Design a protein around this ligand. Structure first.
Ligand code: PGW
Ligand code: PGW
Ligand code: PX2
Ligand code: CLR
Ligand code: PLM
Ligand code: D10
Ligand code: CL
Lengths: 33, 190, 51
C-alpha cells in the first residue's frame, strides 16, 4: 500500500472544522442579542 | 423568538453532545492513532491498546494484538493511562446523554450546569489522555515498528493518522460544548 | 463570566446545591432504563461492527 496519509487527514480535518464552524454559528445565534 | 431560539439552540446542543459521544467512541475503539511511513522499517499501526504490525515480506500479513480487557497486552503504562482516561471521558459524555432524561422532571438550568461540568471533565480527561499517550512511544514494540529514531515525545519516522487528530477535534468540541452548556444554563434563568 | 455573574453563580450551582430527595423513584424510572439501553448500544456496536 502507498503508506501516505493526506487524503484521510484532509477529510478528517475538513469534517472537524465543519463541525467547529457550525458550533461557532450556534454561538452566533446565541450571543446575538 | 427568545424562547423559540433558546429551545432550538438547546436541541442543537443536544445533537452536538450526541455527535461528540460518537466521535469519542470511534476514536477510543479504532486503533489508527499512529501509522507507518515510507521510511519505516516495518509496516503497521497502533492505537491506545490495540496494535497491528506487518511481518515485513512484501505483503500485509498483519499480526494484531492488544485489548483493553487484558492490560498485560498493552505495550506500556502510558498507553494504559491514556486508555483509562479516554474510557473515563466516554463514561462522562455517555453519562451526560443519560442525564438528558432529567429534563422531564428537574429544572432545566441546573441540569444544563451538571452537563456543562461533565463535559468539561470529559474534555479534561481527553486532554490528559492525549498528553500521556505520546509518553509510551519509548516502548520496545513501537520502537521496533517505527524504528530506533522514535523516542519519548518524538514522532520520528512514523506519522499521525486520523484517530489522533480526531481526538484533538474531540477535545476542542467537548470544551466548546461545555462553555455552550454553561451559557445556556445561565441564559435560561434570564 | 462575561455575563457579569460570579464564578460560583456562573459555573457552580451553589444556590440551593438535598431538599428534593423523595423524587428519586420518579428520577430513577428513566435514569436507569436510559443508561442500560445506552450501555447496550455502545457495547454491541463496539464488538460486532467497530471491532
Ligand atoms: C444514537 C444516540 C441517540 C441518543 C438518544 C438520546 C435520547 C435520550 C433519551 C431520552 C431523552 C428525553 C428528553 C426529554 C426532553 C423533554 C423536555 C421537555 O419537556 O421540554 C421542555 C424544554 O426542554 C428542553 O429544552 C430540552 C430539549 C431536549 C432535546 C434533546 C432530546 C431530543 C433528542 C433527539 C434525538 C436525536 C437523535 C439523533 C442522533 C443522530 C422542558 O420541559 P418543561 O419546561 O415543561 O418543564 C418545566 C419544569 O418546571 C417541570 O417540567
Ligand atoms: C463476578 C462479577 C462481580 C464482580 C464485578 C466487579 C466490577 C468491577 C468494575 C470495575 C473494576 C474492574 C476490576 C477488574 C479486576 C479483575 C482482576 C484483573 O484485573 O486481573 C488481572 C489482570 O487483568 C487485566 O489485565 C484487566 C485489567 C483491566 C480491567 C478493566 C476492564 C474494564 C472494566 C469495565 C468497567 C466499566 C464500569 C462502567 C460502569 C458505569 C490479573 O493479573 P495477572 O498478573 O494475574 O495476569 C497475568 C497476565 O499474563 C494475564 O493478563
Ligand atoms: C414498560 C413500561 C410500561 C408502562 C409505561 C410507563 C408508565 C407511564 C404512565 C404514566 C406514569 C407517570 O407519569 O407517573 C409516574 C411519574 C410521576 O409520578 P406522580 O407523583 O405524578 O404520581 O412520572 C414518571 O415517572 C414518568 C413515567 C416514566 C416511565 C418510564 C417507563 C420505562 C419503562 C422501561 C422499559 C424497559
Ligand atoms: C453508565 C453509563 C452512563 C455509561 C456506560 C459506559 C459503557 C458504555 C462502557 C463502560 C466500559 C466500556 C467497555 C470497556 C472495554 C471495552 C473493550 C474494547 O476492546 C471495546 C470497547 C469496550 C467493550 C468498552 C465499551 C463501552 C463500555 C461498556
Ligand atoms: C438517578 C437520578 C439521579 C438524580 C440526581 C439529581 C438530579 C438533580 C436534582 C435537582 C438539583 C437541584 O436542586 O437543582
Ligand atoms: C456509526 C458507528 C456508531 C458507533 C456507536 C456510537 C455510540 C454513540 C454514543 C451512544
Ligand atoms: Cl479490548
Amino acid at each position: 500500500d502507498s503508506r501516505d496519509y493526506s487524503t484521510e487527514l484532509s477529510v478528517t480535518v475538513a469534517v472537524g472544522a465543519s463541525l467547529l464552524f457550525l458550533n461557532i454559528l450556534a454561538f452566533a445565534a446565541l450571543y446575538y442579542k | 423568538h427568545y424562547m423559540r431560539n433558546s429551545r432550538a439552540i438547546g436541541v442543537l446542543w443536544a445533537i452536538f453532545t450526541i455527535c461528540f459521544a460518537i466521535i469519542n467512541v470511534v476514536v477510543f475503539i479504532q486503533p489508527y492513532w499512529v501509522g507507518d511511513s515510507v521510511s519505516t522499517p516495518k509496516p503497521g499501526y497502533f492505537g491506545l491498546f490495540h496494535y497491528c504490525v506487518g511481518s515485513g515480506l512484501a505483503g500485509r500479513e498483519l499480526t494484531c494484538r492488544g485489548s483493553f480487557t487484558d492490560f498485560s497486552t498493552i505495550p506500556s503504562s502510558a498507553f494504559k493511562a491514556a486508555a483509562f482516561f479516554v474510557l473515563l471521558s466516554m463514561v462522562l459524555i455517555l453519562g451526560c446523554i443519560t442525564c438528558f432524561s432529567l429534563f422531564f422532571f428537574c429544572n432545566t438550568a441546573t441540569v444544563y450546569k451538571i452537563c456543562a461540568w461533565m463535559q468539561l471533565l470529559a474534555a479534561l480527561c481527553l486532554v490528559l489522555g492525549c498528553m500521556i499517550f505520546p509518553d509510551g512511544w519509548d516502548a520496545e514494540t513501537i520502537r521496533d515498528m517505527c524504528g530506533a529514531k522514535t523516542g519519548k515525545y518524538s514522532l520520528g519516522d512514523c506519522s499521525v493518522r486520523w484517530a489522533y487528530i480526531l481526538a484533538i477535534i474531540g477535545i476542542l468540541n467537548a470544551l466548546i460544548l461545555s462553555f455552550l452548556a454553561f451559557v445556556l444554563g445561565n441564559r435560561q434563568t434570564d | 463570566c462575561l455575563d457579569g455573574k460570579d464564578c460560583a453563580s456562573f459555573f457552580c450551582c451553589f444556590e440551593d446545591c438535598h431538599i428534593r430527595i423523595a423524587k428519586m423513584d420518579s428520577y430513577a424510572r428513566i435514569f436507569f432504563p436510559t443508561a442500560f439501553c445506552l450501555f447496550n448500544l455502545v457495547y454491541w456496536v463496539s464488538y460486532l461492527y467497530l471491532g
